């Protein structure tokens, strides 16, 4: 019936003066644009059909052509930025926002989906959707006593579209828009659907990816305990955004970091730092590195939770990018730690894996490691045990590596290595 129409037949039907013919052709276009293999988005655009689809969004008396045109435009807007721009350029944003209040649930949901694709293009279209007034009608669809009474697919689409309104930087979303969205977002973050939870975590991870004022807006809403719970979920699609959000939060103030620790996050890192997914392991070590850049009492919590052996392990064996984050966690630890905390680091076996990574070609890790070695020596100077440390480094072959680094072409590298050689190995 409406399967495998040509663009020229679609155009003929839409250009007819006959609404039912227009409805049939619009469905035929929807089916073309919903095929998995090379949907002819550009051909449909070149045919000039977008302004017609947008007009059809306003045909209140023919809800089927509203639905069919909304679906067609959603699939166009799901493509490249240029294809999304063509939808926006046709006036689709205010048309779709007016459809959010449709009494036909499947039409409102399609409008939600379409606006998610448009906002998801980038910050400019995101802010344009907001300026057209999308947030109030979107939040009204979620203003129910219990989210469980909404259809699962509907709720997932609403969550995903709100997450795109939280996404992207330069600029970040408007502060008033974030404040308007957050209470509903925290409600979704407590829902039981895994997909709603994943996308709510993603939204929170976007809102915390920025200056400490942005982090504070989110933390103030009390979401950190829920995030830590989701950090232990079995679903990798939940753990990943949950961990990103927690990681972002601990880039903030020591007080914001302390709420993560107070919520019990460190007890999850034995698993995260051994997680079979390389990206989870890397992000967990990056998170640890910002925690060890904190206060001495926060370093002490890292010790109390038994996480230094886990950092020794990642340094010993892990994807190189994870090992790089581990070197940062160690150097930050040695930078702000007490003499006793730094000593404990050596007792846990940090020296040998740290020395073995000086053989890495990456120049930055070498500078990070050498700075950690210096801080560890300085802690040993205060106990008069520099010699015993020097012997550890020689026995595991670190002295040979530091000596060879005096020939390194980078300036700061061959500078720091020489200082250690002359200061402690002479």
């Amino acid at each position: 019936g409406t399967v495998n129409w040509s663009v020229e037949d679609i155009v003929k039907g839409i250009n007819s003066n006959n609404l039912e013919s227009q409805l049939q052709a619009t469905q035929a276009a929807r089916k073309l644009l919903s095929r998995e293999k090379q949907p002819p988005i550009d051909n449909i655009i070149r045919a000039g059909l977008i302004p017609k689809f947008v007009s059809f969004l306003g045909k209140t008396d023919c809800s089927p052509i509203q639905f069919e045109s909304a679906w067609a435009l959603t699939n166009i807007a799901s493509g490249t930025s240029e294809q999304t721009k063509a939808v926006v350029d046709g006036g689709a944003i205010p048309a779709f926002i007016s459809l959010l209040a449709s009494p036909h649930a499947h039409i409102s949901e399609q409008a939600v989906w379409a606006l998610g694709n448009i906002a998801g293009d980038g910050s400019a279209f995101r802010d344009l959707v907001i300026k057209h007034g999308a947030i109030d009608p979107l939040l009204a669809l979620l203003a129910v006593p219990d989210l469980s009474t909404l259809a699962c697919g509907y709720l997932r689409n609403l969550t995903w579209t709100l997450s795109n309104l939280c996404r992207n930087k330069n600029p970040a979303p408007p502060l008033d828009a974030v404040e308007q969205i957050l209470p509903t977002l925290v409600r979704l973050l407590h829902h039981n659907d895994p997909e709603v939870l994943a996308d709510s975590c993603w939204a929170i991870s976007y809102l915390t990816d920025g200056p400490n004022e942005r982090i504070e807006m989110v933390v103030k809403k009390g979401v950190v305990p829920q995030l830590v719970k989701l950090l232990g979920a079995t679903e990798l699609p939940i753990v990943t955004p949950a961990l990103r959000a927690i990681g972002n939060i601990v880039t903030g103030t020591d007080e914001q970091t302390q709420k993560v620790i107070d919520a019990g996050a460190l007890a999850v890192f034995p698993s995260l730092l051994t997680n079979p997914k390389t990206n989870i392991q890397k992000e967990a070590t990056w998170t640890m590195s910002n925690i060890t850049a904190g206060r001495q009492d926060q370093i002490q919590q890292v010790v109390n939770h038994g996480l230094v052996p886990f950092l020794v392990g990642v340094l010993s064996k892990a994807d190189f990018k994870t090992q790089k984050e581990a070197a940062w966690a160690i150097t930050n630890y040695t930078s702000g730690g007490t003499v006793e905390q730094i000593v404990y680091l050596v007792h846990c076996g940090i020296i040998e894996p740290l020395m073995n990574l000086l053989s890495a070609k990456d120049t930055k890790i070498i500078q990070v490691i050498l700075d950690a070695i210096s801080n560890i020596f300085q802690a040993a100077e205060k106990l008069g045990e520099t010699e015993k440390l020097s012997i550890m480094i020689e026995e595991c072959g670190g002295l040979d590596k530091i000596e060879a680094l005096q020939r390194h072409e980078n300036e700061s590298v061959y500078k720091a290595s020489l200082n250690l050689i002359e200061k402690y190995f002479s």
Binding site: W71, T74, N75, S78, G79, Q110, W113, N117, G120, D121
Partner: peptide
């Protein structure tokens, strides 16, 4: 991100 329906 962007998602196509069916």
């Amino acid at each position: 991100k962007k998602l196509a329906r069916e």
